[PDB]
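ZP: hey, is the heme C complex queued? I don't see it on the tracker
AM: it wasn't, my bad. submitting now with these inputs:
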Amino acid sequence: AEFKAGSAKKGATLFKTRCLQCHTVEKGGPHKVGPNLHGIFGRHSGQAEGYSYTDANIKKNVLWDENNMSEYLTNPKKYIPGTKMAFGGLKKEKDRNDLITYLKKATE
Ligand code: HEC
């Protein structure tokens, strides 16, 4: 139910196949369709500098941690109604744990 650390190696592969199309992770990385994700954890939503968010994403004002990130990625539009992230989600809990384990380090 809660987040448990997993395989960052698998998480990186998940990011390439599922996220890299719309996202980058390094500091100073370019925005694409979606925002650069550097410094995302321990930060309130809508605060990637340079990126223009929806009202939905800003109004949600979620302080991103591993658990709500997992809930978010299960079904983005369910968690933040009106968001323009055209992504259906990661339904498998193992995938979400793996992906988030990678993200926490890659956006550190
Ligand atoms: C497009 C094809 C996307 C894919 C695939 C993924 N994401 Fe995304 N994401 C996208 C957009 C356009 C946005 C902004 C939505 C808005 O309402 O403005 C997002 C947003 C996020 C966020 C929130 C960032 C914030 O600062 O609040 C996160 C944390 C995020 N995306 C993560 C993420 C992950 C982990 C993905 C794959 C595993 C992923 N996204 C795919 C566009 C797209």
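AM: back. The chain is about 40% helix and 0% strand.
ZP: great, adding it to the tracker
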